Design a binder for these strands. Structure first.
Lengths: 222, 156, 49
DNA sequence: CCATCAGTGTACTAGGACCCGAAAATTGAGTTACAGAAGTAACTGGTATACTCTGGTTTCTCTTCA
DNA sequence: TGAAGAGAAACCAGAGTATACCAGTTACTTCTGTAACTCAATTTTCGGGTCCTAGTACACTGATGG
């Protein structure tokens, strides 16, 4: 007994179930209400040496479905369900397979044609355009992206050169986090001018040639 | 430099566009286009003839769906208006937009200030301002032989 | 038999892939720069024409 | 018969976006200073994915003693 | 007279070798602010309307029932 255990009780009882193939319109009508608890009646008629299966559509639902059985000896089928509470169980074993066919032949294709046309609605096609489009590259005093970026740079303003002591303290404090830093990445952390930062870094720091990516600055003066 | 050269070439050939019709294509602001345009005219030691109102009409009236009749109409209105000094010191593009608005509201296909502002690249306020300057002298600007379905004696 | 249509459709996808590749390259430059990109400017119309 | 009790036929609100114009404010060019900060525009290493003989290998008959 | 190696003509991976991008940074400019008058273009903002759909009050009507 565990979460992954399968409740194989249905197999023990050898419960039999029927697998039925039905078209979409029959199920679509059921899906319309799908909560009235009734969609039709399944009638089975048996004779001395012949059995026939047929289904009748509900009168309210509409506002004959002959059934053909199929051999199940070529493949063994079982039905299982997964509970929302993580408790899998086996409903039973399929004992017969059936298929549903339309009683009508001529006007039935008309319904199918509507479905094919209906499923063709998302099929987008190129549209002829009477007048050439004149709204492209239409007059703008400035592109919106240009004003946004320029405004941001102006607001963010200037990278102040802090007193060497403050810059040095920040550099040494950040050195503990990692052994080596990239010049570009170090600039963001220190937020100082590249030329000014390089001069400070040169005064104490040095760059070591690394054969894996490239020569990078090392915060350790020695 | 490329945008300024494009503008100078369009102006030299005799089919000038506006800076707003080059900034609409380039990636830089009209300010930089104008700056580099002046810089290029200064460097090359060349010049470009002054734009007139009849240059922006074959394109503005065609970008709009106006007929050729309304186009020659607005051409005549604008040329006469700049002749009769109704619009002193105002940019030819705003005068062109005003004249096109007049000839459009007068003729069959009417266009609002908004569409003409989008096409010409002129704020509708400027269209108003330079339309009130040619508003009272409407009839003597139009072509004499001019058919229309809205009386030129009544215009907004 | 590859008629005009299928032959043209063969070219369009190659030329449309270049168009989509080109806008990706153009946008990547501006996005990395930190500034949004203009869609009209990203499209190279001469690729298909 | 005088109580009561929906409807009715309206100007009068109640939200509910929405628009029209005016006036103020800005932008833009022109100059000339001023210091410093952005903002591209340029040459110059640096290390990996193929790559091209090549050094070794491997039977497979044979070489050289023994 | 084979034996233990001697020589010989095949494959086969791999280590320098060869490219192949891919960043890595030095000058060298523009672009700020302030000032001013100018004029036109363009935007912003701002008080008030404007139209429209949806209830709302209120006097009267029209039965209705006990």
């Amino acid at each position: 007994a565990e979460r992954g255990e399968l409740d194989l009780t249905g197999a023990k009882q050898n419960t039999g179930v029927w697998l039925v193939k039905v078209p979409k319109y029959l199920s679509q009508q059921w899906a319309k209400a799908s909560g009235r608890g009734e969609v039709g009646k399944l009638r089975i008629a048996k004779t001395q040496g012949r059995t026939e299966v047929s289904f009748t559509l509900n009168e309210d639902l509409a506002n004959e479905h002959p059934f053909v059985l199929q051999s199940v000896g070529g493949q063994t089928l079982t039905v299982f369900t997964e509970s929302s509470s993580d408790k899998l169980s086996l409903e039973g074993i399929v004992v017969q397979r059936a298929e549903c066919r339309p009683a009508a032949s001529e006007n039935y294709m008309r319904l199918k044609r509507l479905q094919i046309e209906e499923s063709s609605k998302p099929v987008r096609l190129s549209q002829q355009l009477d007048k050439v489009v004149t709204t492209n590259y239409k007059p703008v005093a400035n592109h919106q992206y240009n004003i946004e970026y320029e405004r941001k740079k102006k607001e963010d303003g200037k990278r102040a050169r802090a007193d060497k002591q403050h810059v040095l303290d920040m550099l040494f404090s950040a050195f503990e986090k990692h052994q080596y830093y990239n010049l570009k990445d170090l600039v963001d952390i220190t937020k100082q001018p590249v030329v000014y930062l390089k001069e400070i870094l040169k005064e104490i720091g040095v760059q070591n040639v690394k054969g894996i990516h490239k020569n990078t600055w090392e915060l350790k003066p020695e | 430099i490329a945008s300024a050269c494009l503008y100078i070439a369009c102006r030299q050939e005799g089919v000038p566009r506006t800076f707003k019709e080059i900034c609409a294509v380039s990636r830089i602001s009209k300010k930089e286009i104008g700056r580099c345009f002046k810089l290029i005219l200064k460097a090359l030691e060349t010049s470009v003839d002054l734009i007139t109102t009849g240059d922006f009409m074959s394109r503005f009236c065609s970008n709009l769906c106006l007929p050729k009749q309304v186009q020659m109409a607005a051409t005549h209105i604008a040329r006469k208006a700049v002749e009769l000094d109704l619009v002193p010191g105002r940019s030819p593009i705003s005068v062109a937009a005003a004249a096109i608005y007049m000839a459009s509201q007068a003729s069959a296909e009417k266009r609002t200030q908004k569409e003409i502002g989008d096409i010409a690249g002129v704020a509708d306020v400027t269209i108003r301002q330079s339309y009130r300057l040619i508003y009272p002298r409407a009839p003597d600007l139009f072509p004499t032989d001019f058919k229309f379905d809205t009386p030129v004696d009544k215009l907004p | 038999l590859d008629l005009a249509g299928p032959l043209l459709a063969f070219l369009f996808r190659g030329m449309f892939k270049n168009l989509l590749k080109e806008v990706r390259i153009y946008a990547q430059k501006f996005i990395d720069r930190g500034k949004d990109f203009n869609l009209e400017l990203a499209i190279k119309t001469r690729i298909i024409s």
